[PDB]
């Protein structure tokens, strides 16, 4: 019975872990894309500043 | 019998002026132009050669024509100094904007002055009790020191600064100078009324505070200078009247931002992130003047806007070294309702030293930070896997950290309209003893919410017993 | 061949005409080109003037004549613009003929200083249950509407302009609130359809539309809000109250960066110029509540900002957040769920409104604000226990949630709002099914409209509740529930 | 005659474009008619780019500019000891003239491949963690790196303070003369530091060279190089000097300002293309000289600031590749109670155990690796795992060794004090003591050895090694104290 009780708890545990783990992934991907875009802009600025003279 | 020249170029805040013959006006000199409104004042920033100077204007340059007449004043922007400025509201160019007529001062000093030398420095370490828990416990402010309140947009800088004006300025005894830099004209107005309604300013008696404004409605020239105006007034009180000056500035970030709006137009190759190459030296020339010398002392509080919540942005980044205490307000914390939104781990003071605050205070502060740090080290494990995956050791340290965190919040008197609870001022010794006790595991059997938005330990028990029923 | 009132085009490209001469020109003076297109004298140098074009580059050629106006960029203002739709320069575009103007304000005008102002005390009643109870707007205030794309941002502005039908019909001048809607970068089709709605609800007669749509020369988009501000200001300056909606500032700032880049101004964060903050700050500073000595006129601004993927940390959003007196944040997560208005409670604040919100709402919404910012918190931690005490608060939370869903184009008077809030906060809804709360509303309204009309009359006229009147609604509600 | 003098064509932001000066050397000093000094960096055909060492409020178009005939130099010599001067070595403490034994230029070549000998002499910091795990040699260059407010200065400062133990003796070769360079710091902060140095009787062997936040960018740029030459006098004349560049992050920022305003087309993050060379030539000047050159040495501790722990940033990356090892400070460690907040995993001193006292080397057998094994072990603990005889035993000791390395500020220890504690830690003698009591174990075990076993310490402070006899004598002396 303890076994059965554990397996059904571990399931529900993993189920929320996956839910939170997956919800964090969304917020980090969003952060990634900002930081990706920012890296392109900033390299582009250096190159534009350099050519400006 | 003066020296005149003509306007040769206008680009936004930048006006190039040519002078007919042998004498060009010195860099930093104020020049003037007749308008059907009043005068437009220009400051000489550089010498272009071929008898032209480049100036930053101090107001909108709408309507200026090429070939218009410009008059050298033979000096920099001057401001009224001395007791005659208290209870008045002042321009960047030292004009009264309170419809109360002339500010008849005896002397009118220039706003550009060399910072106090190395031998003129006066180093000390007295604690300035603020009555605000987080600061008093973890990052205490220093008398005659510089203090920065770092923050993203709408996280609580100004309220913090108004609380300290309210907590400290009233019963200080020395004079104050408040400089509004690139902030809400509305907020200026709002404060003016407060000074009357608390009696720091009396329209018909004695006044404790001078007011200087250059809000976010003025041009960059005005915003780039207005801090020097407020500063010059404060320097008189410190140096000539030997006073212990309180100089509040909100918001100092805007002085740098303004500098960057003209930088390109002054023909400088931009530095990292679009900022003027002169970022740090411009900051030094202002910041190094806001200082305690041997003649008197200057305790200063300065708001620091953090653009795009990025603390690494050149502007705020550069400011850090200039401050004796930093209190960093964090959007993350503010969105948990923990006010004041102080980051108890990224705020810092010089005076958190076992010699200055005593061993006990230091020890409590350290153990509090340790506990807060453990929780932070676990945020991610707590976030994904939750509380049940932790060792019973950590489970306890977290549960306590969660209480301490709430206990670091405090109803501000000025924030009454948002808490609905009357403000609390808590005393340093009462703060120190309270947290010491929470560390000693004497309050663990008590609900978290009891620690939220109260004063010292006696209110926690109070809220706890009330929330039982 | 006058070279003082007149110039020859040297070169044209990237939205800039370079002109020789125009010796007597003023900075920011408007010009007129051979082809009829207009421009602004932006920078005056020895030997040439740089002019920003208010149309397509096509329309200007090297060699063409350029004429002075002796006018700093300005617009027709006054009460004759009510019911009209104009472009950034104030040109009539509704096809309704010459604009009846009382005068002409400059586009750039300085904001009132420290002294001519007074604290907000008068409400702008949006007619939106969520807004007016939680984030109330005062006349003279600047509140920001901000959220992801397709999140009902416009609908909050719109249902506000609609809601003024109640007062702008009466004689009472001080209570009249004229509206100014500023469409910047939007589709022409949208704006036309929107104007269609304003007429359909009669509201067009007291509102003025200024539009620089999506395909129009960037500098016309950069200019729109300012000239719209001038127009809004006439009412402030003369003793009446105007509401101004900037839909949206994001697109304006985009239009602005275009010019700056094409002008070769150093790009900074996200390639926006250093002065993009100043762009917005000088604008929203013109929204003010004036003192006794200046007629007591009020300009209220509702800027709209578009976030990307709900990130309120971006450069432009935080800039405008740092200029306004609060923001109503609309969460894309709630909007998709059905909860509309999709107000995020924790992330929304009015900074000055409370002291201007009608006292009647203030009492019945006792701590409503701080509560909904906490139900939302305990709700996420619910999905380890089927606990007893927090279980009832969750039902309260859900009933208050479902109570704050509101239809578009359905704004309610304060007297309709107060009882609805009374029935929730005081737990009269906790015995009702979740899927029936919407039906409860208009049936509970039906009941108050045809029986207890005497309480409803009282609330409108006072703006308060007496102890006597509080015990009156107490009885009225409880009777209805059991039937 | 525009050979020796020129005329200002244009002036702004501390830069002057000057006509004439047709004989001026590159990097030569100039006086302006108004008083302010400056440096000629751009010899272009038509004109000269000159960067000023003062305010430009007083330079005017047409103003005359005079040659000096001098490449920027500074006063040097023992006369500077106990004084505070500016970038050009003008005295700023208001104590009168500087007593100069001569003048070195600001920009000097490093000692080449020949005039050197391998580093072999300890710079004792008095910091249990540094001395044991990242020991530093005379002639070495160790980098102190971390975010703001992590204890970076505090690591250089304890070291400066700790040289008290030899600087009051008559022995010269044992002495270490201190030069601290404040670049971009505010004045009140430098004041507060010399106020400490005075209070610990430490100013008398220190020279402070400071160019602070308010000062013209070329002054901040130049300050480390001039401070170097000041240190080099000691190195060149058979003595030892330590130099602390606090901090080079700020120096590079200044150097960028110069360049941008001179209109030298920028490189990465707007810095000059040669911003690495700026530092690389500076830190190559710290060296241990050969015998034929009198065995003198200059030891550099440059400080670098990171943002948000980004060691991978541009200027951090440069300097890491210049120095001989790094001390890495972490805020996360600061707040776990670990102070100095040294990251052992990341910290190295490449000179290694060649510049560590043999006694300390002996007791710190595998200690650096041992702690790596500890943090590998404590990583598997998080898994909520119960351990065995091997994994609990090591987890326990490492946790105690960590605690042993915690150290108060301004309180440097002697090697004869350090050696015992480490011996007591690594050899098992602390493993069964409550962790909150490891601080009290320190000063109690020290007190105990000072009275009862004072022959043991004298043997270590003078023989610097551990004979089998001393090890047995220590083994017993510790076990004795364990039961009080
Ligand atoms: N002590 C406090 N307690 C509760 N709420 C607070 C507190 N301080 C600030 N707030 C909230 O934060 C809002 C704005 O705070 P404010 O002091 O204006 O921060 P700010 O950073 O100066 N604003 P900005 O200039 O836009 O960046 C207030 O309207 C409150 O809703
Ligand atoms: N309370 C409401 N209930 C149901 N639908 C609504 C509500 N408010 C608005 N909508 C609709 O939802 C859609 C998007 O809302 P809208 O008012 O256009 O927000 P927005 O943020 O301006 N979108 P956009 O301008 O395209 O970025 C429109 O079709 C609206 O008519
Ligand atoms: N061993 C220590 N134990 C406790 N506190 C310390 C220790 N070392 C330094 N501190 C304190 O930590 C704080 C910062 O140390 P400090 O030496 O100023 O670092 P820093 O890198 O110079 N900071 P900054 O110069 O602002 O970038 C000061 O308050 C010190 O007193
Ligand atoms: Mg503010
Ligand atoms: Mg819309
Ligand atoms: Mg430091």
SS (HEC) of D168-235:
CCCCCCCCCEEEEEEECCCHHHHHHHHHHHHHCCCHHHEEEEEECCCCCHHHHHHHHHHHHHHHHHHH
Are C41 and C25 within 8 A, CB to CB? yes
Does B108 participate in catalysis according to the annotation? no
Looking at the CA of residue C306, tell me the nearest atom of ligand 2: 27
For chain C, give percent helix, strand, coil, nearest 5: 40, 20, 35
Q: Token match 């007297």: residue?
A: C415
CA separation (Å) from C22 to B319, B327, C370?
46, 54, 61
- Partners of residue A50 in chain D, C-beta under 8 Å: 265-267
Are B20 and B37 within 8 A, CB to CB? no
Give, for C196, the enclosing helix (H) or strand (E).
helix C188-200
CB contact under 8 A, D269 and A46: yes
The SS3 call for residue C71 is: strand
**Helix axes C437-450 and C467-481, enclosed angle (nearest 10):** 120
Q: Is B119 exposed, middle or buried (0-12, 13-18, 19+ CB in 10 A)?
A: middle
Show which of D312, D331, D356 is a domain's final residue.
Answer: D356
Any chain A CB within 8 A of the CB of D263?
yes
Q: Please count the CA atoms within 13 angstroms of the CA of C118 that sit on its side-chain side.
A: 15
φ/ψ of residue C83, rounded to 5: 90, -5
- Total domains present in chain B: 3
Tell me the C-alpha distance between B390 and B388, whole Å. Answer: 6
Q: Which are the contacts of D384, defined by CB distance < 8 A and separation ≥ 6?
A: B389, B390, B391
CB contact under 8 A, C113 and B153: no
Q: Which are the contacts of C311, defined by CB distance < 8 A and separation ≥ 6?
A: A30, A34, C317
Q: Are residues B97 and B213 in the same domain?
A: yes
Angstroms from C365 CA to nearest CA on chain B: 13
Q: Which are the contacts of D259, defined by CB distance < 8 A and separation ≥ 6?
A: D266, D271, D272
- Token representation of residue D299: 């030891």
Among candidate residues B327, B298, B297, B4, the one with its CA nearest the CA of residue B140 = B327
Residue C215 Cα to ligand 2 midpoint, Å, equals 22
Q: Transcribe D8-75 into DSSP letters.
A: EEEEETTEEEEEE-TTPPTTEEEEETTS-EEEEEEE-SS-EEEEESS-STT--TT-EEEEEEEE-EEE
Q: Are strands B14-19 and B52-57 parallel, antiparallel or unpaired?
A: antiparallel
Chain-centre distance for alpha carbon C324 = 11
- Buried b / exposed e along D188-211 (16+ C-beta atoms within 10 A): bbbbbbbeebeeeebbebbbbbbb
Are C71 and C63 within 8 A, CB to CB? no
Specify the residue with its C-alpha closest to ligand 1, atom 25.
C322
CB contact under 8 A, A53 and D270: no
Q: Which residues of A touch chain B, with CB atoms under 8 Å apart?
A: 13, 16-17, 20-21, 24, 42, 45, 49, 52-53
- Token representation of residue D163: 């040289």
In this structure, which ligand is nearest to the CA of B340?
1
Regarding the domain with residue range A14-53, which homologous superfamily does it belong to in the CATH classification? Answer: ATP synthase, gamma subunit, helix hairpin domain (1.10.287.80)
Are C98 and C91 within 8 A, CB to CB? no
Q: Token match 């590159």: residue?
A: D26
φ/ψ of residue C89, rounded to 5: -85, 0
Can you give chain B as a three-state secondary structure string? CCCEEEEEEEECCEEEEEECCCCCCCCCEEEEEECCCCEEEEEEEEEEECCEEEEEECCCCCCCECCCEEEEEEEECEEECCHHHECCEECCCCCECCCCCCCCCCCEEECCCCCCCCCCECCCCCEECCCCHHHHHHCCEECCCEEEEEECCCCCHHHHHHHHHHHHHCCCCCCEEEEEECCCHHHHHHHHHHHHHHCCCCCCCCCCEEEEEECCCCCHHHHHHHHHHHHHHHHHHHHCCCCEEEEEEECCHHHHHHHHHHHCCCCCCCCHHHCCCCHHHHHHHHHCCCCCECCCEEEEEEEEECHHHCCCCHHHHHHHHHCCEEEEECHHHHCCCCCCCECCCCCEECCCCCCCCCHHHHHHHHHHHHHHHHHHHHHHHHHHHCHHHCCHHHHHHHHHHHHHHHHCCCCCCCCHHHHCCCCCCCCHHHHHHHHHHHHCCCCCCCCHHHHCCCCCHHHHHHHHHHCCC
Show which of D24, D47, D70 is a domain's final residue.
Answer: D70
- Buried b / exposed e along C383-417 (16+ C-beta atoms within 10 A): eeeeeeeeeeeeebbbbbbbbbbbebeebbebbbb
Are D316 and D155 within 8 A, CB to CB? no
Q: Are residues D98 and D245 in the same domain?
A: yes
Q: Are residues C344 and C392 in the same domain?
A: no
Q: Are residues C113 and C262 in the same domain?
A: yes
In this structure, which ligand is nearest to the CA of B180?
4
CA separation (Å) from B205 to B172, C282, D85?
18, 36, 49
Tell me the C-alpha distance between D185 and D298, whole Å. Answer: 23
Q: Are residues C304 and C322 in the same domain?
A: yes
Contacts 24+ apart (CB under 8 A), B192-196: B192/B89, B192/C114, B193/C119, B194/B162
A-C contacts at Cβ under 8 angstroms: 16
Q: Are residues B327 and B212 in the same domain?
A: yes
- Token representation of residue C215: 């395909």
Q: Which domain holds residue B467?
A: 352-469
**Helix axes C368-382 and C389-403, enclosed angle (nearest 10):** 120
CA angle centred on B67, ends B66 and B73, rounded to 5°: 110
Q: Which residues precede a break in chain B, with C-to-N distance above 2.5 Å?
A: none
Q: Are residues B468 and B357 in the same domain?
A: yes
Among candidate residues D466, D404, D391, the one with its CA nearest the CA of residue D430 = D404
Tell me the C-alpha distance between D332 and D338, whole Å. Answer: 9
Among candidate residues D18, D27, D26, the one with its CA nearest the CA of residue D66 = D18
Q: Are residues C112 and C186 in the same domain?
A: yes
- Buried b / exposed e along C177-198 (16+ C-beta atoms within 10 A): bbbbbbbbbbeeeebeebbeeb
Q: Are residues B214 and B233 in the same domain?
A: yes
Asked if residue D299 has its Cβ within 6 Å of ligand 3, the reply is no
Q: Which are the contacts of C448, defined by CB distance < 8 A and separation ≥ 6?
A: C419, C455, C456, C476
Chain-centre distance for alpha carbon D40 = 30
φ/ψ of residue B17, rounded to 5: -125, 135
- Total domains present in chain C: 3
Q: Are residues D78 and D62 in the same domain?
A: no
Torsion of CA C147, C149, C150, C156, to 10 degrees: 40
Q: Please count the CA atoms within 13 angstroms of the CA of B395 that sit on its side-chain side.
A: 10
Among candidate residues C51, C55, C119, C49, the one with its CA nearest the CA of residue C88 = C55
Q: What's the count of helices (H) and strands (E) in chain C, helices before strands?
A: 15, 18
Q: Are residues C140 and C277 in the same domain?
A: yes
- Token representation of residue B327: 């209190």
CA angle centred on B254, ends B251 and B257, rounded to 5°: 160
Show which of B351, B375, B406 is a domain's final residue.
Answer: B351
For residue C102, the 8-state DSSP code is: S
Q: Are residues D457 and D467 in the same domain?
A: yes
Among candidate residues D17, D21, D14, D19, the one with its CA nearest the CA of residue D53 = D14
D428 assigned ligand-binding residue: no
Q: Please count the CA atoms within 13 angstroms of the CA of C274 that sit on its side-chain side.
A: 25
Q: Are residues C262 and C317 in the same domain?
A: yes
Tell me the C-alpha distance between B44 and B51, whole Å. Answer: 13
Nearest CA in chain C to B194: C119
Tell me the C-alpha distance between B372 and B386, whole Å. Answer: 17
The SS3 call for residue C435 is: helix
Asked if residue C286 has its Cβ within 6 Å of ligand 2, the reply is no
Q: Are residues B392 and B287 in the same domain?
A: no
- Token representation of residue D402: 């960590």
What CATH number corresponds to the domain at position D238? 3.40.50.300
Specify the residue with its C-alpha closest to ligand 1, atom 27.
B153
Tell me the C-alpha distance between B464 and B458, whole Å. Answer: 10
What CATH number corresponds to the domain at position D6? 2.40.30.20
For chain D, give percent helix, strand, coil, nearest 5: 40, 20, 40
Of D263, D268, D269, the CB nearest to A53: D263
Q: Which are the contacts of D217, defined by CB distance < 8 A and separation ≥ 6?
A: B281, D14, D51, D254, D255, D257, D258, D261
- Token representation of residue B160: 């913090």
Torsion sign over Cα C155, C157, C161, C164: positive
For residue D141, the 8-state DSSP code is: B
* End-to-end alpha carbon distance in chain D: 87
Annotated binding site of B for ATP: 151-158
Asked if residue D339 has its Cβ within 6 Å of ligand 3, the reply is yes
Are D177 and D160 within 8 A, CB to CB? no
| Ramachandran region, residue D275 (left: φ > 0; alpha: ψ -120 to 50; beta: rest) | alpha
Which of C108, C274, C316, C377 is the best substitution to test chain B (most B C-beta atoms within 10 A)?
C274
- Buried b / exposed e along D106-134 (16+ C-beta atoms within 10 A): bbeebbeeeebeebebbbbbbbbbbbbbb
What CATH number corresponds to the domain at position B193? 3.40.50.300
Are C315 and C296 within 8 A, CB to CB? no
Q: What's the count of helices (H) and strands (E) in chain D, helices before strands?
A: 16, 18
Tell me the C-alpha distance between D415 and D132, whole Å. Answer: 10
Tell me the C-alpha distance between D331 and D399, whole Å. Answer: 19
Q: Are strands D136-137 and D122-123 parallel, antiparallel or unpaired?
A: antiparallel
CB contact under 8 A, A16 and C383: yes
Q: Are residues C105 and C10 in the same domain?
A: no
> Resolution, rounded to a tenth of an Å?
3.2
Of A20, A49, A52, the CB nearest to B383: A20
Annotated binding site of B: 151-158
Neighbours of B309 (CB within 10 A): 19
The SS3 call for residue D155 is: helix
Does D117 participate in catalysis according to the annotation? no
Give, for C300, the enclosing helix (H) or strand (E).
strand C298-306
Q: Which domain holds residue D245?
A: 71-356
- Partners of residue D263 in chain A, C-beta under 8 Å: 53
Are C402 and C417 within 8 A, CB to CB? no
**Helix axes C414-425 and C467-481, enclosed angle (nearest 10):** 70
Looking at the CA of residue C407, tell me the nearest atom of ligand 2: 1
Are D258 and D41 within 8 A, CB to CB? yes
For residue C164, the 8-state DSSP code is: G
Cis peptide before A13 (omega within 30 of 0): no
Q: Transcribe C123-152 into DSSP letters.
A: EE----HHHHHHS-EETT-B-EEEESSSSS
Q: Which are the contacts of D169, defined by CB distance < 8 A and separation ≥ 6?
A: D175
For residue D122, the 8-state DSSP code is: E
Neighbours of D457 (CB within 10 A): 18
Show which of B351, B370, B390 is a domain's final residue.
Answer: B351
Q: Are residues D345 and D371 in the same domain?
A: no
Q: Are residues B63 and B82 in the same domain?
A: no
- Token representation of residue B117: 């030398």
The SS3 call for residue C31 is: strand
Which of B264, B307, B385 is the best substitution to test chain A (most A C-beta atoms within 10 A)?
B385
Any chain B CB within 8 A of the CB of D210?
yes
What CATH number corresponds to the domain at position B385? 1.10.1140.10
Tell me the C-alpha distance between C375 and B21, whole Å. Answer: 75
Torsion of CA C334, C335, C337, C339, to 10 degrees: 70
Q: Are residues B328 and B364 in the same domain?
A: no
Show which of D48, D70, D92 is a domain's final residue.
Answer: D70
Tell me the C-alpha distance between C16 and C465, whole Å. Answer: 61
Tell me the C-alpha distance between B398 and B444, whole Å. Answer: 11
Angstroms from B348 CA to nearest CA on chain D: 8
Q: Are residues D48 and D94 in the same domain?
A: no
Looking at the CA of residue D155, tell me the nearest atom of ligand 3: 17
Question: Which residues sit opposite B62 in a β-bridge?
Answer: none
Tell me the C-alpha distance between D121 and C5, whole Å. Answer: 83
Neighbours of B419 (CB within 10 A): 18
CB contact under 8 A, B65 and C25: yes
């Amino acid at each position: 019975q303890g076994y059965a009780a554990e397996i059904s708890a571990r399931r529900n545990a993993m189920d929320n872990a996956s839910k939170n783990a997956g919800d964090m992934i969304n917020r980090y991907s969003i952060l990634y894309n900002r930081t990706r875009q920012a890296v392109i802009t900033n390299e582009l600025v250096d190159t534009i500043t350099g050519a400006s003279s | 019998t003066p020296i005149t020249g003509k306007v040769t170029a206008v680009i936004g805040a930048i006006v190039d002026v040519h002078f007919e013959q042998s004498e060009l006006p010195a860099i930093l000199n104020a020049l003037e132009i007749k308008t059907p409104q009043g005068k437009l004042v220009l400051e000489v920033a550089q010498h272009l050669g071929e008898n032209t100077v480049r100036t930053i204007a101090m107001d909108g340059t709408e309507g200026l024509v090429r070939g218009e007449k410009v008059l050298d004043t033979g000096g920099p922007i001057s401001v009224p100094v001395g007791r005659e400025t208290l209870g008045r509201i002042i321009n960047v160019i030292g004009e009264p904007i309170d419809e109360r007529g002339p500010i008849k001062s005896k002397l009118r000093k220039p706003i550009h002055a060399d910072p106090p030398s190395f031998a003129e420095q006066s180093t000390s370490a007295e604690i300035l009790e603020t009555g605000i828990k987080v600061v008093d416990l973890l990052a205490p402010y220093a008398r005659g020191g510089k203090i920065g309140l770092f923050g993203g947009a709408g996280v609580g800088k100004t309220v913090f600064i108004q609380e300290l004006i309210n907590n400290i300025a009233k019963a200080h005894g020395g004079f104050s100078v408040f400089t509004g830099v690139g902030e809400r004209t509305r907020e200026g107005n709002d404060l003016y009324r407060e000074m009357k309604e608390t009696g720091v300013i009396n329209l018909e008696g004695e006044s404790k505070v001078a007011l200087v404004f250059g809000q976010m409605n003025e041009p960059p020239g005005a915003r780039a200078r207005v801090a020097l105006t407020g500063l010059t007034i404060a320097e008189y009180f410190r140096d000539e009247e030997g006073q212990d000056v309180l100089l509040f500035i909100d918001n100092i970030f805007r002085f740098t931002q303004a500098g960057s709006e003209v930088s390109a137009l002054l023909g400088r190759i931009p530095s990292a992130v679009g900022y003027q190459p002169t970022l740090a030296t411009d900051m030094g020339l202002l910041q190094e003047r806001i200082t305690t010398t041997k003649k008197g002392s200057v305790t200063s509080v300065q708001a620091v806007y953090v653009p795009a919540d990025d603390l690494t942005d050149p502007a705020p980044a550069t400011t850090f070294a200039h401050l004796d205490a930093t209190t960093v307000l964090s959007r993350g914390i503010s969105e948990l309702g923990i006010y004041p939104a102080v980051d108890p781990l990224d705020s810092k003071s010089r005076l958190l030293d076992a010699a200055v605050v005593g061993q006990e205070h230091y020890d409590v502060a350290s153990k509090v930070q340790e506990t807060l740090q453990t929780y932070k080290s676990l945020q991610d494990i707590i976030a994904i896997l939750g509380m049940d995956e932790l060792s019973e050791q950590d489970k306890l340290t977290v549960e306590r950290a969660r209480k301490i965190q709430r206990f670091l919040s405090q109803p501000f008197a000025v924030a009454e309209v948002f808490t609905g609870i009357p403000g609390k001022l808590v005393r340093l010794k009462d703060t120190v003893a309270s947290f010491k006790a929470v560390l000693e595991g004497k309050y663990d059997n008590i609900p978290e919410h009891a620690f939220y938005m109260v004063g010292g330990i006696e209110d926690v028990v109070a809220k706890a017993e009330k929330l039982a029923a | 061949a006058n070279l003082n009132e007149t110039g020859r085009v040297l070169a044209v490209g990237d939205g800039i005409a370079r002109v020789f001469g125009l010796n007597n020109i003023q900075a920011e003076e408007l010009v007129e080109f051979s082809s009829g297109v207009k421009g602004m004298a932006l920078n005056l140098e020895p030997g040439q003037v740089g002019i920003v074009l208010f149309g397509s580059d096509r329309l200007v050629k090297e060699g063409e004549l350029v004429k002075r106006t002796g006018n700093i960029v300005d617009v027709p203002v006054g009460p004759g613009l009510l019911g009209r739709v104009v472009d950034a320069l104030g040109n009539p575009i509704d096809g309704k003929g010459p604009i009846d103007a009382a005068g002409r304000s400059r586009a750039q005008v300085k904001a009132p200083g420290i002294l001519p102002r007074r604290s907000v005390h008068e409400p702008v009643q949006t007619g939106l249950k969520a807004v007016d109870a939680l984030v109330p707007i005062g006349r003279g205030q600047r509140e920001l509407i901000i959220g992801d794309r397709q999140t009902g941002k416009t609908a909050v502005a719109l249902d506000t302009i609609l809601n003024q039908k109640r007062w702008n019909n009466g004689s009472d001048e001080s209570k009249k609130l004229y509206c100014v809607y500023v469409a910047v970068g939007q589709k022409r089709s949208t704006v036309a359809q929107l104007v269609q709605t304003l007429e359909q609800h009669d509201a067009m007669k007291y509102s003025i539309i200024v539009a620089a749509t999506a395909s129009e020369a960037a500098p016309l988009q950069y200019l729109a809000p300012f000239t719209a501000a001038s127009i809004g200001e006439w009412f402030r300056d003369n003793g009446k109250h105007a509401l101004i909606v900037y839909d949206d500032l994001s697109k304006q700032a985009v239009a602005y960066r275009q010019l700056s880049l094409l002008l070769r101004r150093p790009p900074g964060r996200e390639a926006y110029p250093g002065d993009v903050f100043y762009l917005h700050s000088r604008l929203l500073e013109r929204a003010a509540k004036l003192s006794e000595k200046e007629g007591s006129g009020s300009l209220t601004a509702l800027p709209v900002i578009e976030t990307q993927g709900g990130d309120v940390s971006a450069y432009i959003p935080t800039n405008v957040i740092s200029i306004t007196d609060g923001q109503i944040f609309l969460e894309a997560e709630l909007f998709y769920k059905g909860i509309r208005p999709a107000i995020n409670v924790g992330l929304s604040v009015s900074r000055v409104g409370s002291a201007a919100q009608v006292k009647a709402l203030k009492q019945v919404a006792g701590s409503l604000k701080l509560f909904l910012a906490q139900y939302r918190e305990v709700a996420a931690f619910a999905q380890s226990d089927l606990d007893a005490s927090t279980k009832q608060t969750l039902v309260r939370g859900e009933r208050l949630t479902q109570l704050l869903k509101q239809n578009q184009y359905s704004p309610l008077a304060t007297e309709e709002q107060v009882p609805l809030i009374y029935a929730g906060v005081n737990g009269h809804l906790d015995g009702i099914e979740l899927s029936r709360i919407g039906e409860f509303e208009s049936s509970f309204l039906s009941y108050l409209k045809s029986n207890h009309n005497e309480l409803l009359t009282e609330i409108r006229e006072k703006g308060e509740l007496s102890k006597e009147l509080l015990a009156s609604l107490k009885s009225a509600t409880e009777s209805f529930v059991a039937t």
